[PDB]
From a paper:
Tde1tox interaction with Tdi1 increases thermal stability (melting temperature 67°C versus 55.5°C). A Tde1tox/Tdi1 dissociation constant of 18 nM was measured by biolayer interferometry (BLI). We therefore obtained crystal structures of the Tde1 Ntox15 domain in complex with Tdi1, as well as a homologous complex from P. vulgatus dnLKV7, Tde2tox and Tdi2. The Tdetox/Tdi complex homologs exhibit very similar structure despite 51% sequence identity between the Ntox15 domains, indicating a conserved mode of effector–immunity interaction. When bound to immunity proteins, Tde1tox and Tde2tox split into two subdomains. There is an ~32 amino acid region disordered in the crystal structure, corresponding to β2, α6, and the surrounding loops in the Tde1tox only structure. Notably, this disordered region contains part of the HxxD active site motif and most of the DNA binding site. Superposition of the Tde1tox alone structure with the Tde1tox/Tdi1 complex indicates a conformational shift characterized by a hinge motion, as well as an ~180° relative rotation of the two Tde1tox subdomains. Upon immunity interaction, Tde effectors undergo a dramatic conformational shift, highlighted by superposition of the Tde1tox alone and Tde1tox/Tdi1 complex structures. The immunity protein does not sterically occlude the active site, but rather splits the effector into subdomains and structurally distorts the active site, which is disordered in the crystal structures.
We identify a horizontally transferred T6SS with Ntox15 family nuclease effector (Tde1) that mediates interbacterial antagonism among Bacteroidales, including several derived from a single human donor. Effectors with novel toxin 15 (Ntox15) DNAse domains, also known as toxin_43 domains, degrade recipient genomic DNA. Cognate immunity proteins are encoded adjacent to T6SS effectors and neutralize their activity to prevent intoxication of self and kin. Crystallographic snapshots of isolated Tde1, the Tde1/Tdi1 complex, and homologs from Phocaeicola vulgatus (Tde2/Tdi2) illustrate a conserved mechanism of immunity inserting into the central core of Tde, splitting the nuclease fold into two subdomains.
Author numbering:
A (entry chain B): 2 to 194
B (entry chain A): 162 to 218, 222 to 270, 303 to 316, 329 to 343
The structure:
């Protein structure tokens, strides 16, 4: 993950991961994701745009909006400044994948299981940031708004699902967990992108 | 207008009750969301809602199976052209005539919306904060 470390502006690694903690995910996620945990830890990367989070702290809320077959497990590992969620899905029938859950628009997108390309290439590619993650307004929002801390995000008030307009005027720094919980209770099921 | 109560009420789910501070923050969120809605005209709330329904849309295993195959093909381009436009990559992947091409290509807010539509310059008037269900 030399590329990830070189291309992330103003990285802050807030903490390393306990090894005993991440090794209970041995059979749930890829070796690649585990290596990324050891490198990235808990932190804020790419000039504040992405955060690596404690998976079990996001486990319940992803199972709340991401429907799964009984042979699937989902492990959250990264979020956007908006509270969008990246998670690794273990799937024993068709093989693994990553799901990008856009909390603003109520969609999920099936991404490749390959964490190496996602994190060294995809999140630095401007058109993926725009077309996959709808993150293109970030540099514009971040000149007018402070940086959310790792337990905060740019929330829309009101939420876009709740009829809010998508503009910088409706953005507030809110605590991420009750926000995401409220947005999900406002929306039906996630829609496939 | 007439006061539209969110149906069903929001929940304070049991998993989040072990933390005594969560409910407080939830209530704060629900209140700030409610004021944000009530600050809108009915027209613009309906405008945004129908705009929102435009994003996103069978058997999920079959769709994910196809998407996995497609994503492996997309990955081959990303490895070679790190800064290439992903729409171009996707179009080239989706244009191949073999491989991928063998695989056939296959609500709390909505309730407020439906109650409002049968109610029909004028401001939205909803209540989100009452009747938080505990457990």
């Amino acid at each position: 993950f030399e590329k990830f470390l070189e291309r992330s502006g103003n990285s802050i690694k807030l903490e390393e991961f306990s090894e005993d903690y991440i090794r209970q995910y041995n059979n749930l996620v890829s070796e690649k994701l585990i290596s990324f945990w050891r490198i990235a830890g808990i932190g804020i990367y790419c000039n504040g745009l992405f955060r690596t989070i404690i998976p079990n702290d996001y486990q319940y809320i992803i199972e709340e909006c991401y429907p799964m077959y009984d042979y699937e497990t989902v492990t959250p590992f990264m979020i956007t400044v908006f509270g969008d969620i990246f998670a690794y899905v273990k799937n024993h029938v068709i093989g693994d994948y990553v799901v990008f859950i856009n909390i603003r628009y109520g969609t999920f997108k099936i991404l490749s299981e390959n964490i190496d390309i996602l994190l060294n290439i995809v999140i630095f590619n401007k058109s993926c940031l725009e077309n996959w993650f709808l993150l293109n307004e970030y540099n514009t929002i971040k000149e007018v708004k402070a940086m959310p801390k790792i337990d905060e995000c740019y929330g829309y008030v009101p939420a876009l699902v709740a009829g809010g307009k998508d503009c910088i005027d409706n953005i507030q720094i809110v605590k991420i967990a009750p926000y995401i919980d409220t947005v999900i209770q406002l929306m039906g099921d996630l829609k496939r992108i | 207008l007439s006061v539209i109560f969110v149906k069903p009420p929001f929940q304070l789910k049991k998993k989040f009750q072990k933390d005594p501070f969560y409910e407080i923050e939830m209530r704060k969120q629900l209140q700030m969301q409610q004021d944000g809605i009530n600050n809108m005209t009915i027209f613009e709330w309906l405008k945004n809602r129908e705009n929102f329904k435009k994003y996103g849309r069978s058997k999920k295993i079959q769709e994910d199976f196809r998407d996995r195959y497609r994503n492996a093909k997309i990955d081959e381009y990303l490895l070679l052209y790190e800064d290439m436009d992903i729409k171009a990559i996707e179009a080239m992947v989706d244009s191949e005539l073999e491989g991928l091409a063998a695989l056939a290509n296959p609500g709390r807010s909505l309730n407020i919306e439906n109650e409002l539509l049968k109610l029909i310059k004028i401001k939205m008037n909803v209540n989100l904060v009452e009747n938080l269900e505990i457990v």
